[model samples]
Target chain A: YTGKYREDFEIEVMNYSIEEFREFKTTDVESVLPFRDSSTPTWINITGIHRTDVVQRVGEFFGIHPLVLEDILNVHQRPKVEFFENYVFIVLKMFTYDKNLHELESEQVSLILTKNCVLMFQEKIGDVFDPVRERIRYNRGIIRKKRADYLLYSLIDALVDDYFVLLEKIDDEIDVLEEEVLERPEKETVQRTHQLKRNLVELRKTIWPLREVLSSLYRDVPPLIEKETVPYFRDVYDHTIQIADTVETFRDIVSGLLDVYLSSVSNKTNEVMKVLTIIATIFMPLTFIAGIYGMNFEYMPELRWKWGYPVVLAVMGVIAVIMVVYFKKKK
Target chain B: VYTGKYREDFEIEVMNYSIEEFREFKTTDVESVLPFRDSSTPTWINITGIHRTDVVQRVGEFFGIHPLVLEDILNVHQRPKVEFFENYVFIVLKMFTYDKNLHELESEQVSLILTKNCVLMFQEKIGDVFDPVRERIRYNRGIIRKKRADYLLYSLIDALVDDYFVLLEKIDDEIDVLEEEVLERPEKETVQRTHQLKRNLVELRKTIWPLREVLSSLYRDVPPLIEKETVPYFRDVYDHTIQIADTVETFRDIVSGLLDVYLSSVSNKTNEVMKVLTIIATIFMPLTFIAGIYGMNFEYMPELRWKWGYPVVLAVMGVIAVIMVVYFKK
Candidate 1:
């Protein structure tokens, strides 16, 4: 009975196994409501969350709680684990890095784990779970032999594992930018450093919450998770912690690099100021002594003497040497 | 064989008391103030001078402590950790204080072992930091006087955690003063001080971060060691820790921002110095060259011998100078 899923919203449902699969439209939600025999795990991938009707139809079929459905549609939930008698609902975020733009793009993805099959929702068409999807289609791993719990584990693990590639890129960027700040530090590099820090902060936010979610799944046997599959979730939890630890080490290095940038800039200015002061101190007095001889007084006998001209020139040179020694000693 | 309870050896001060009354004093004899003797009367043993490994060895076997615990007590820099021993909880903390001679922050290790009836605190001749808790017990004021040993453990922890905020407040005021002088005429001392503060902040973070983990465990996994009544206070300590983390991040940002300002100020000074030098060189160069040329040995026209010659030359140079000045200003 739930209709009006917003005319522009588009979604697809894919149910598959080692041997066969079906690709259906969002309107086909109720047809697979009971998850189509559960003999092989089903992955109901809903792309658009704004379509509450389609979400509600799936919710009604699976007996999803009102709050669960609300969290799915509301779309600002922290990555968390909520267990109900019927199923487990998980909220998480997927972030992709745009290498060219040097920007990170993020979207919210939610999952519902039940006895027979696992239902999932995505905010966009592209996702970090595409690898997991292809693996299930080819039946490459033990994923096909496992239950819906393993399928849930595969999808979450795939999402977390993809971040390593992103982390490698971030580390490289930090290294390159550290050199940039050292060499050509100014508005661009400062902003770059600041931007790097901001992205790390952003990644830290999602990584921590997801880490806690996995930790809870691993440390305790939530009724929804199977005993054999507990080890897989524990592995995923360790991956998240490793990722978090790398982030901390990354920030410490970046912070030291930032300090180095400031130090270099300060030294550069101090360097130039000393040059200007040294030049001024040495030449200013010499210019004055030269000026004295250039001026004429009626009582002055030195102007007419050729020896005077040379000797006074010699005097100007001596005064210049004295000034240099004085300034050098002052330093 | 317990011997020499005085200086050059080790001093063990023990207090046995309940909420009602207790006796506290110093006795040179070791057996009289021996901490292992047990009863309903709660006990607190304060041992100074960790160099006396001999005393901890005896105390260790008496309390069924692992050898590592005794090893940690003597070791000066055992990084902060919480090791649960079923019957006792071993925690290592660093007490922070300012060194007057060094004009820098100094830290010393403080180790604590909590059993059901007693608490054994070890210090490396650390500061008077524990004086407040000692005072709190001596006064026997409020609920702290009326609780079990775990609550006393809580009071001790809560006291230590409270100092973190006080330290941060001092830092806050310092940064506030530094902030105004941030973008001033560059003084190397200011730059040096800014860097010093950053280093101290880093050290302070290291001091606090591990303690947060230690406290989290104190409140969480050790229910037997910490009672339900004191867990809430640990939670309060946890909340203070969260605040401290925020403040540390803020200090980092503020301090780095100061470096930027100081560097830019020096950059401004460099620019000003260059401008002055360029002006002096440009205007004076041509005038000096002209003077050099006119001071030749050759004779000139009818005006060469005139009294008005130097004045004419000076007037022309003045006009050139005026033109240079006007051009630069425009």
Candidate 2:
């Protein structure tokens, strides 16, 4: 059990075990290590909020905003990027494997980036960001050498790249849908098309605004982003614009396909109507002649004659033939 | 009747009949006058293939192509436009008044421009070039004072402007069809919309290409379009572009209206389907429930005990409805 807040901030030089953070009481831990600071940058890894006391301690230790802690605890918040007076807040959506379905599932990863330290928050323990943690530990490439902004950039880049996998999955679905559209379109296909369009629209709504966020980081004159890291931000902008263009082209193609579907349906309906009309036109006259001969009038001479019925039938056949021939000629 | 092939080397001039020429034809009563180049510039008018021979000869002597001697004589060999070496050939679609319909009709007017002379071959007795003629006769606005080339340009411009009136008539028909589409939803509306689109497409095909012809004439560098008078030609080009822009805007509006019609039709169809389904569901559900209750094998059924046993049961059902809930919900 732990209390709600801590008295001081502690910088742990050595990486702590995630399991220990999971078990330790946050209030007791905060009391033990009140104020510890080090020249080297610190990363505190805490997993599982079952120990909320530990989180409260960690939150208080870092002087984290109360609202930021509140948002972290509410895991269903949408992916967002916000700039604070002292730190930048970034929330990224990430995919993880769902054990029950044995398929990918999505969760949110939040990062708070300041000049000297970077704090990461995740809903559950397991994630793809373990490699990033290992890179920081081994002092690989630029992670050990650069400011905390570079670290945040690398993490966000990884998060955005994760969306590529989702986009590829959708692209595969679109290819299958295209085949179905060309061969035989059903109501299900229409529904699926609508769904795909909506999904792309939502994706566009999310990604379009992010371009501005990344661009301003570089272009905002006083600059929260370091000068050396501007090119990386530019790369992200270029990637986003490419995505936007692709989405627009895909939308246009889908709209054209809808037009083709409408025309095909109209043609089918016309063919059906034409067949029914021809049948009705051909049969109505013959039926009328038969009904005239079958009438029970005693003075009807045609019904009494031996060959009259056959002759009238032949005449009807001739008329029907003429009508058919005329139709065929017009066609 | 007059008969002669136009020679390419001879010069041609066509303008208003001057006072001297008009006086000679009226007084001398000559049927034809040969070409005379007395002044710095001479006007020659060749009136060819004359069924109205008297009028043809009067016109021929007045300027000079030839004259018809009989009423039944015909001109059948004129092509649309034929260029002979140095002469510029102009063939035009002339608007004529049809006697039967009392409306304007079209006929061919072929004019051959040779060096220093002009030959105009009319397919009918009187041509619509009468306005230009009256202008020349009165020395109305310096049209007669201008060179023959300038005269030819002015007449052609007038004829082209007249073509705009015919095009506007077709556009009016299209507008009527679009208005009908808005008024009633008919199966033919779709066909008419498609027909209009295709017809407008064809109309644009014809008009857009002619723009290149007009533009080329205005911009051609060599022999440079008679430098003193290119301004008027440029004005015609400007007018043509403005007409083209108007045509494009109208076409865009028509297409937009077509899309709105399609969407509205789809919405109406959906509404129709919903109404059909709702009616079927509403009317049949209670009847189905009554049949379903009679279908059930329940031990305690009170309706089976009552009749009046039959008549009494029918009366009790009226009493049950009146007593149970007639005034409850109301």
Candidate 3:
């Protein structure tokens, strides 16, 4: 009835009260497959989605629609939001810079919010959502007192705030690149520019749809999303818009940097060619005069002149002087 | 008051048609079309040229157009937009035709004012993109002849967008040819052509980007005169506009890459030229020096007196040239 998974999976649950009580538990899919109406809001965090039965059983227990389950299992789904009768499904990307590869890395994070629970599925274990978990466990903020939609908003806000970190990293890299391209452009600089261009493109693809998703959170006013949470969603939507605009500006700057790379490269060649040509122009004439004097004419008048060699040397000197001055003038 | 080139003469073509009857006429007088204002049959008033401010003012007054809308129509440089006035929905957009001879886009501003039973169309020139729509209405060929003023307006807008596709196809071909030429033989003209293509894309993006917004607003904020059934057609056109805008964007990226390729090609050529000059100088400078010494006329130079002097010196120069060539190859 299902295809094979590539790796193992884990599910963790956090049940927190409206006041000060909270409990975290780690269990297998079989144990937590049943939905119990709890007094507190619960968050079920699925670490890996390679195991379809874990996803299927969880979906079956929660009455999640087949499409939502499919989207959760298929990690390539674009950032989107789907509202059902009982639950609100939201999917988005989380970006992190891999310093080792000098490139960007992103993973899809999907959230499903019902009346008393928020189910979040991450492609792997690590994410920026640790802050949210800390806030909930420590009673540091009103997140524990808010509804499930607030928790969903908290998770989304965390995801979007991390995008700024990525943008700042990219901004720093662009500063370095612009300096390098202007001061001395190497072959590697253009490659870096192209890579950054592709990264921005991917960033755009990740965040653009999420903007519309956030817009819908407030506009469509999904029943699962509370009225108080609408303003928070709008705030996040504004941030998404800002991120998109910055991405666009960064794209333009990167494109201009490519032009700068091209121009600087050609400028280097221009300088090199000027040196080559000036050297040849000065030498060719001197060499030709020397060749004329070296000719073995039987009755050469200049060969018998006592001052012939010095005068010819002086003439070569004058020619070199004129050539140097002409080149300098041209410059 | 006007800044750019534009036509001066005014030509008015009015067509009043219904499912049962069709009538068309051409006149320079603006008064002739005023009778269609309250007529039961749907009418299309097509006016070519926008320089006659008096005519525009009179028509705007008669049609209940806002003074600001009339100003936008006469301005001739307004951004592509759709504005819902009190009674009529006014739209302003640029219509582009690729002038192959000039390798430039011939652009004309087109303004459409859609009211209850009549559609007012304004253009900057006589030749336009509405010929196909005109032909269809003349022959009663399609549903266009049976539809109301809203559908007629859709057909006209659709024609303008379809011309964009044609223009884009031509641009696509140009980019393809330039891509090949940049790789094979980059020249000065190649640089100019690449820059021109980039400019064309910029203009195209500016033209279509706002048009997308206009079409979106057209369908999203459907005007009262726009029948709900015809809203879907406007949405379809909006989708096409989005697709066109995407192509224009991709074209921009491709053209930028093309410039980079051209730059590298030119740089490679320069590198090769420099190498040749260096090789010649490195080989010949020594050979010439050796000849200079032999020709120095120095009294105590014994190497010049040896019986095998010329041949030995020649052999030395040949050896130096061969070594330089080998080193250069390395």
Candidate 4:
């Protein structure tokens, strides 16, 4: 009586009850469980860890190990892939759109592959896996006719492909910010650059290790990933490497842009300082002339004579004009 | 006729000019004349373009390259290495110091070897091969005493090593200016940074390519360098690599330091702007308030009416000073 809708081609849902979902915990023990005999590949979707009893029961029914169950329960594990005796355990992060906040959020998803069935576990109900589910139901592609391992490959491949879309979104934001920085680099521009750098660092940490996981899966001998399916895994490995290169190149560009921003800001300040210094230099002698005559000393007779003040003023005006002309010529 | 002094071990003399010093020109015919030698043992010295007949004849007598005398006489040549059948022929640059006015101060000696004889040649009349000559005569290390080829190797290696110290001195001066830029931002600092970057790039260009030559001489098959001498040549290669690494690391540090200086200057400008804004706001606000009160024209002004109007004015002024002080305290 699981709340989520299921398709007929998903054999794990057809074979097990809601209570049995708990027993399929440890990836190692789950490998030994008898293969599901449905006409199409089976997909097991486990959700809602609040029902620990149901999770444990499902693990027991599927012969899953206690350690695997423990790993599945822990929410903060790094992205990883491991192969037990008979099955492959793959853990990946799923990025989704948070509709309310209008931001991207990520959650960890683990997949366990058996001979004839694929057990998928998710943290919550909503996911990008609906297309995979629909393909399984309609038998529209080879998923229904191929071995269970191929279905698992396709699902994992879809998850890896989503990374490019996420990265492209980030690149678009960076492109807009680059022009803004050149025109007028306000405090907000600096803050945005710092924030983007932080996000990229975090994304790098997650994706870098995951590349090794995919590479090892292709290179290592795991029973669940048959010899024929190795090429498919290699394809995934290539995608991961391309994604890694893009991330590193983007990081280099961001750092170079930060330098350009600082240089432009400094150049602006230099222009301002030059103008102020030149003004002070020009006014110094003229201001001194006015101050010398304005002093009410007994011998200062220029203030009493109409012609004396006018001539002194004329001299000051002439000096100011000469200074301005000299500055212009120097430029 | 030579005008400078000459000694058995160390010679410092000016003779008939041989080749142009600091000549970076490429020569064509000289390239074909110098046979390409491929071996791991020989100490090959390939000299190209002998424009001056006297220098070519003298170098041929020293290295014993006889039939190819016309090849050495030609000045324009491509970069070539000659393998003289049994011995090694080496052609390399001879860099020397110029005066402050950039006059041709001295020539660098480019010595060649093909088997047992070690022949020294120079671009000009005299050169600075004395240091290596003294080392060979005094210590008797490597092949100086054993073979003429080893003596040739020792001379070239010593010259190259000494050039590093001179280049490092120039770089050190540039680094000092860069350090000053870090401490104080000036209009000239940007130009200085660009100049320093270009200098390092050029230096790297000069030093990195010759590394292939040095290492290939040691590791590849050359006939002149004997079995025992291979280890010393390899050690020279190791030393050159270490020097290149040090230069590259220093260049990287200089670039990073330039970036830091740029960032710090930006922060300094921001701080100056904030100070100016605060000063203007603080001084003008109080002055504006005093002018506003005096400008007001009200009918019921008690202070304007009094018997001792001017004396009362002075007393009210004192009271206003005390009140202003009390307001400032708040």
Every candidate's lDDT: 0.70, 0.50, 0.73, 0.53
lDDT of 4 by residue, A155-184 (tens): 877787788787777767667766766455
* Residue range B153-226, candidate 2, lDDT tens digits: 44544455546555555555655665576546544335434443544444344443455454444434214236
Error of 4 at A69 (Å): 5.2
Ten consecutive residues with minimal summed lDDT in candidate 1 chain A? A1-10
Residue-wise C-alpha lDDT for candidate 1, range B1-330, written one tens digit per residue = 111222244566876666877667756455665544466766787877667766788778777889877776766644688887767778888777743234367676778888777888776553545677777677776776688888787777778877877777776777776776775445555665666677778878887778788888877766575466777778888788888788889889988887778667766766756665577677766777766564544554443456667556667778887877878857
Model 4, residue B294: what's the lDDT? 40
True contacts kept of each: 0.13, 0.00, 0.25, 0.00
Return the top candidate by lDDT: 3
Classify candidate 1 by CAPRI docking class: incorrect
Runs of candidate 4 with Cα error greater than 4 angstroms are: A1-41, A45-57, A65-76, A82-88, A96-102, A122-147, A164-196, A215-235, A263-331, B1-231, B252-330
Q: Show where candidate 1 strays beyond 4 Å.
A: A1-331, B1-9, B28-37, B169-190, B259-265, B284-321
CA-based DockQ, model 2 = 0.01
The best candidate by DockQ is 3
Question: What ranges in model 3 sit over 4 Å off?
Answer: A1-331, B1-4, B176-185, B279-327
Error of 3 at A278 (Å): 8.8
Measured against the native two-chain assembly using Cα atoms, what DockQ does each of the candidate structures obtain, in the order listed?
Answer: 0.09, 0.01, 0.12, 0.02
Q: For residues B13-113, write the lDDT of model 3, one tens digit per residue.
A: 99888776688999888788887899888888888777778888898888777777887776665578877766777888787777555677767788788
What TM-score does each of the candidates earn? 0.48, 0.42, 0.48, 0.46
Clashes of each: 0, 17, 0, 42
